[PDB]
Each structure stands twice: as structure tokens, then as C-alpha cells.
Design an enzyme around this catalytic site. Structure first.
Site, short mmCIF file in Angstrom:
data_model
loop_
_atom_site.label_atom_id
_atom_site.label_comp_id
_atom_site.label_asym_id
_atom_site.label_seq_id
_atom_site.Cartn_x
_atom_site.Cartn_y
_atom_site.Cartn_z
N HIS A 10 1.01 -1.25 0.04
CA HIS A 10 0.14 -0.21 -0.18
C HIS A 10 0.90 1.30 -0.01
O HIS A 10 0.18 2.28 -0.18
CB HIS A 10 -0.93 -0.09 1.23
CG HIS A 10 -0.46 0.35 2.61
ND1 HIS A 10 -0.10 -0.50 3.59
CD2 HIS A 10 -0.04 1.61 2.96
CE1 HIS A 10 0.42 0.11 4.53
NE2 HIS A 10 0.32 1.47 4.23
N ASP A 42 -0.02 -7.37 1.59
CA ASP A 42 0.35 -6.23 1.63
C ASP A 42 1.91 -6.03 1.81
O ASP A 42 2.46 -5.55 2.45
CB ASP A 42 -0.29 -5.39 2.80
CG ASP A 42 -0.05 -3.85 2.91
OD1 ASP A 42 0.46 -3.37 1.73
OD2 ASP A 42 -0.26 -3.12 3.89
N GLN A 94 0.80 5.65 11.62
CA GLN A 94 1.04 6.32 10.38
C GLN A 94 2.51 6.76 10.17
O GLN A 94 3.09 7.42 11.27
CB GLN A 94 0.08 7.56 10.32
CG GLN A 94 0.33 8.08 9.19
CD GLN A 94 -0.07 7.41 7.72
OE1 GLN A 94 -0.96 6.64 7.75
NE2 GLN A 94 0.66 7.68 6.66
N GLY A 95 3.15 6.21 9.08
CA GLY A 95 4.50 6.66 8.77
C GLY A 95 5.43 5.21 9.09
O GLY A 95 6.73 5.37 8.57
N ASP A 96 5.00 4.51 10.02
CA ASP A 96 5.76 3.05 10.08
C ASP A 96 5.41 2.10 9.07
O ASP A 96 6.19 1.17 9.18
CB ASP A 96 5.40 2.70 11.71
CG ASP A 96 5.88 3.53 12.73
OD1 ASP A 96 7.12 3.88 12.62
OD2 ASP A 96 5.17 3.61 13.72
N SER A 97 4.44 2.28 8.39
CA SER A 97 4.04 1.14 7.59
C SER A 97 5.24 0.60 6.40
O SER A 97 5.89 1.52 6.06
CB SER A 97 2.92 1.84 6.46
OG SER A 97 1.72 1.54 7.20
#
Lengths: 239, 239
Positions: free
Chosen positions: A44, A91, A186-189
Site C-alpha cells: 500500500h 500487503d 502512520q509513517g511506520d508502514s
């Protein structure tokens, strides 16, 4: 990373910042360095977009302190990735790097879980990245963070989810604290889950999703869900 | 607005586009025209920001052919607005206009709900605005949208939320369709909820919040939450 602490430089030698070209470069996701010209991230993070770079050996993003960097030349997302499917299936994505990133200084290559790895339920593991320190915050972290947490089984993971969001599957590896106080954000993905509480460890997951509410985007009250590297290892190796 | 259709110009005579000056003017929120020099919006649309204008009698934003407009002199946010508290309480603000906006043509002043108004549970209502047409889209709507939906009681609202998001209060008015296909979306905040499915209706809510996830920022499977005008009427009139 919620509930964690500053990493030290070189603690996660394979931790990358995946940068997207907007007005200028900006951190959009983590990624995982596999080899001199190969990296791993969440599908993603790249699907539907183009124009990416990875920073290697970085620590404080606003300091521009990376040790090496390369443009991403090509991306292969898993062919059964579904951004809108229950549980965000498949993912994972590999990335080819234009410029070689060497194992040197604070940069090194991850050792991935084997395809026949056990599921690690109950094991300590570390999450790392530059994601938000709290789901309500407006910005991401300046300094690379990490936190020690506990892998759960599929059934345990779903028992810890909202009743109508029991979408954790064996292709996932989920972590959760019993106090409900740590997790990814959010931002670690696209970043690594590193096995063990300290020292060198294999990379066993890729950061994928979690649960939010309107005032806090990444609740540690619920698990953080990663793509399970052992499940995807053969595909990663073939791509 | 998700699940809706193009409105006509003047359908909602009091619907404004609240523009913020960044690179150039851009639509940031809806607002509601109250009188020649006064408008209403959500507190989160104006808190901590400055440099606004309202467009009245607009239809397609790219056409730029609103009937009237005014710069905003000052804004006043509800003193107890709390962006972090569960339910995002007290999400209302007023705005003073530099240039008088006349009730003429496709522009008119809202009839606000009185403070003695009941809960309107079960009634139809209309939502209008230039918010995104789908939570997964990147951009707001170009043509003003509206949708018909159903007002729910406080308890019914919460019954339709996820169990960890039971944040709806009596100071809110919520709407939800049983089919799960209608709702407000980013860009709609600050705009009006109009009582009834058709005809002239009082403005009974101000767009405030809804449920989203990281890939779809507004989910019509759950209610859309407005600040209840009857609850806030005395504050709005005095400010």
C-alpha cells in the site's frame, strides 16, 4: 511508533526511509533493505504512486543524516494485493534500487524469516520506524523510534480486535501489549518487525495496519498488524 | 458528500465555500451564511488559522462564478472546543464578514434551529458540500453535492458506531442510512445539515466528524456526526 523510545543509530541496520516525490521528497513509509539493489515494503506504500527514493543509515530525518541513498527503479506489488479487502490482503512489495547500497557503516541487510519459520506467538519482538509518536499528533517522528512488544497468535489477535473487524489471517503477524500501550502508527508502514527484545534479530514482519478512531489514528488498545515474512518469503525471494 | 448527487445552484441558499489562503485560495470547509456579515462553521475549520474568505451562491468551484463573496475579518471558536476529547465536543465557530452578503438571487440566510428544537430522530435531512465524493479519492468535489439521509437519536447513533467509538453526545446530531452508502466527507466540515428530504428546511447541524481508516477517510457504513444547532444556538447568536 507509540509507547517507544529513541533508537540508537545502527540499531536497525536495514531500516530504510521510503521517500515519495511530492513538492519535494518526504517520508511516506518505512522499508527494509534486503540486498545491495533490493528492498521490501508494504504494497500500500507504493501502489498507485510513482517516484520513490530510499534513505539508508538515517536516524534524525530533519537532519538529512542518511549514510547512503538510492532511487527506486521499479516496484513489484503482490499481484493479489487489495487495498480495500478485509485485512488488507497481501500487503507486500519489492523494490529494485538504481544505486547499490552497501553493507557498511550503520547500514546492513536484513535476514528474513524462513518460509518454514514457526509463528512466534508469545515471542518478544521490536517495531521500529519514524511513524507518529501518538495517533493524535499531526507530524511524524524526527528520530527513529523502537518499541518491544509481544507477537500474538491469529486467534489471539482477532480476539483483541473490534468484533466486526476480525480480519487477522495467518498471512499476518500481529503484536499487542497486554497493557494496550504500544504499537505502530502512520509513517511506520512498510518497516520491519525485528525478532527478539535486543541484539540482532531476523525480520519477521512488514508493518501494514491497525485500528483508529476520529481523534487518534493508531490505537495501542488494539493490535498492530504486519505482513508475515515467513508466509511471503518465497514470493519475496522470487520477486 | 458520499452517495449523493450534484445539487443545483441556490438549492441551499446559505451554503458557503470557506476558502483558506495557502498557495492560492482553496476550499477548506463548508460554512453557513447567517446574515449580511455573519457566518457559521466548525471550530476545527478555523482554530489556529487565519486568512479566510467565503463564496456565496457558488456551484462548480472550478467555474469561479459565485454570486457574492467576502473576506473574513475575524473568527470566534467555541471556548470549550476540544479537538482531542472523545466526540470532538463544541465544534462550532462564527465568522465576521468584511463585505455585506445580500439575501438575493441564489443566496439567502439560514433559518437556524431554535434552542427549543427536539432531537428530530427518524426524520430525513439533507447534507450538502464540496467534500470528497469517496473517502478513497484524493480530491474534493468540483460541483456542490447533496444527499438525503436519516437523523438518528443519540443512543441509536452510538449503536451504529464501532463499540470503541461510542462518542456521540446530545450536543451532536447524527445521520446514517441503513444501506450504509451516504455521508459527509473531508471538505464538507463546517457546512449545513438541512431538515427534511425536500423543501425549505431549517439548518439543524454543522458538519463535524465521521469514521475513517487510513485508506478511506470517510466511511458511510457508520454515521456522520454534526454539531447540533439547537444545542449551540444561544452561543451562536451571542458570538
Amino acid at each position: 511508533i507509540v509507547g517507544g523510545q529513541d533508537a540508537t543509530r545502527g540499531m536497525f541496520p536495514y531500516q530504510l526511509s521510503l521517500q515519495h516525490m511530492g513538492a519535494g521528497w518526504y517520508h511516506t513509509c518505512g522499508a527494509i533493505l534486503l540486498a545491495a539493489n533490493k528492498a521490501l515494503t508494504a504494497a500500500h506504500c507504493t501502489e498507485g504512486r510513482e517516484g520513490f527514493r530510499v534513505l539508508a543509515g538515517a536516524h534524525v530525518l530533519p537532519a538529512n543524516d542518511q549514510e547512503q541513498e538510492s532511487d527506486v527503479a521499479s516496484v513489484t506489488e503482490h499481484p493479489e494485493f487489495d487495498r480495500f479487502g478485509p485485512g488488507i490482503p497481501n500487503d507486500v512489495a519489492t523494490m529494485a534500487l538504481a544505486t547499490a547500497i552497501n553493507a557498511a557503516g550503520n547500514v546492513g541487510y536484513a535476514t528474513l524469516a524462513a518460509a518454514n519459520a514457526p509463528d512466534y506467538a508469545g515471542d518478544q519482538a521490536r517495531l521500529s520506524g519514524w511513524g507518529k509518536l501518538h495517533g493524535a499528533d499531526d507530524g511524524i517522528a524526527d528520530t527513529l523510534q523502537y518499541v518491544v512488544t509481544t507477537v500474538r497468535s491469529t486467534a489471539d489477535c482477532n480476539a483483541r480486535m473490534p468484533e466486526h473487524i476480525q480480519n487477522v489471517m495467518d498471512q499476518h503477524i500481529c503484536v499487542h501489549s497486554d497493557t494496550g500501550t504500544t504499537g505502530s502508527c502512520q509513517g511506520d508502514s512498510g518497516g520491519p518487525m525485528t525478532h527478539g527484545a535486543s541484539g540482532s534479530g531476523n525480520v519477521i514482519g512488514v508493518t501494514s495496519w491497525g485500528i483508529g478512531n476520529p481523534v487518534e489514528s493508531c490505537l495501542p488498545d488494539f493490535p498492530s498488524v504486519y505482513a508475515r515474512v515467513s508466509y511471503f518469503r518465497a514470493w519475496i525471494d522470487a520477486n
